Design a protein around this nucleic acid. Sequence first.
RNA 1: AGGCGGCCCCCUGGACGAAGACUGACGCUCAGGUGCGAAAGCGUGGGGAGCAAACAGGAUUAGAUACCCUGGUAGUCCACGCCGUAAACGAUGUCGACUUGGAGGUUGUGCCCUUGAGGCGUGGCUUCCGGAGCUAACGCGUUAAGUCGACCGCCUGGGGA
Lengths: 117, 55, 150, 51
Amino acid sequence: RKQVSDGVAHIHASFNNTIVTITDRQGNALGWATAGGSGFRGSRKSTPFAAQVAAERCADAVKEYGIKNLEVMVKGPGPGRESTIRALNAAGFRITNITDVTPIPHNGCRPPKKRRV
Amino acid sequence: EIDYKDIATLKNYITESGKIVPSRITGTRAKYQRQLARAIKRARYLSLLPYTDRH
Amino acid sequence: RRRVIGQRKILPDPKFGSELLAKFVNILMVDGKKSTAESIVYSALETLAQRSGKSELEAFEVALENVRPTVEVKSRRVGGSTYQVPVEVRPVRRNALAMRWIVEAARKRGDKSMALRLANELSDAAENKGTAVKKREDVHRMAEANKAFA
Amino acid sequence: IKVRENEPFDVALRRFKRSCEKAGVLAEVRRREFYEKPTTERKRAKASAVK
RNA sequence: AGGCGGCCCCCUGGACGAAGACUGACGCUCAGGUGCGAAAGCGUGGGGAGCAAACAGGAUUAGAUACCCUGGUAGUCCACGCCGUAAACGAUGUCGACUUGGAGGUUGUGCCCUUGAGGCGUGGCUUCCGGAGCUAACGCGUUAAGUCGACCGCCUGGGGA
């Protein structure tokens, strides 16, 4: 459509996959990518590593909107919730602020099944 | 002063995550901490606080 | 469970004091005979000087550097089924593998005179085609996929 | 959860992990424990001066 | 007892206190009786977002009418009744009095500049350790499995039941 030079980057992390979607203030997506859709399967799809590729695949789909400065919003408990922030900061962007919608730690879920020392 | 229904008093007993603080900084002499921790939850229903910071 | 054993420096060459050449004869040694390597040593560099050999300051040390191993792996485990991981090799290993890669690439098909089969490979060691390069890229296409969960 | 702090870079150092509470170095847990030790060692015994 | 939980205003049994007053053994337990439900189920109609026996499919395996994954009915909820069973567990039947200790709470009431992060008394509760006592040994320990008494039920090797 027409460039806007401002928006929000939403990182939504599940125990199997990670979604990276950039939105405008009118309440819609500009660009989306996922850790699975970045060519990852099984125990690789559920990594913080596959989420770092999703930032550069979202950067390839938001190209039309003229955005260089954006703020971050983190969602979900999954393993991709931290690793991809600094990778998006390396994809041709500047991060103005960081926020999250994390509950306080009482829900538990997914013991690590890996090392750990 | 001396009551929980004033936000400039109330904000001294809670965090930037909506949580209640330890007794060591409430001035309750460790004897009214139980009642103050309930008065802070009562402030949510008096339109002074949101029910959780994440919403 | 810790090997790491001793310390072994080996001897240099008797004619110029070379450390690389005195090691390269230990790759061409077969049946415990070093004489067969001394028929290939200097003669490959002098046969390169019949086709393309320009400058000899390092002899063949830069052909062994244009030959570039990168796709070495190890196996990681916590029980039965294992997980492959790539490894960043030391220059002493990178050199030891490059010395086999080129003499095994020169042995790939049967022909006359190993000094001449190696000179044909050293004339290629300025552009590196087919042998010692086409298998590398076909396994390097997993080199980051085998880092994902460490 | 905090950690909203705007560093564009991953740091090559430990700053908040494995050294303060819930193990290691402080508040150690499991990895073999001893139960006669608290009913054996009560007062020093050494440190004045070994040298 | 089972268990009880967002807040706000109600309806309401019990318990605890201080000064007085009025009773004058009114104290304990109880054969057979007479009564409480966590969850799931039923009797009758409503209500139906999660979720979920069954149902309906997929995967796995040589097989899988199971695990696991994807959909999903009864049910969960409300009224008027039924079911009366549980780790109902603190594996500790029920009434009182008697008893060297340590450490931490909950709530009345008396006297004090509370000139004390309250203090010293006096009442009712309540938690983690620990010594005398108990005991096959584990476990109990002033809220005892201790100590001295009152009362009601059951057991006598297990399989078979």
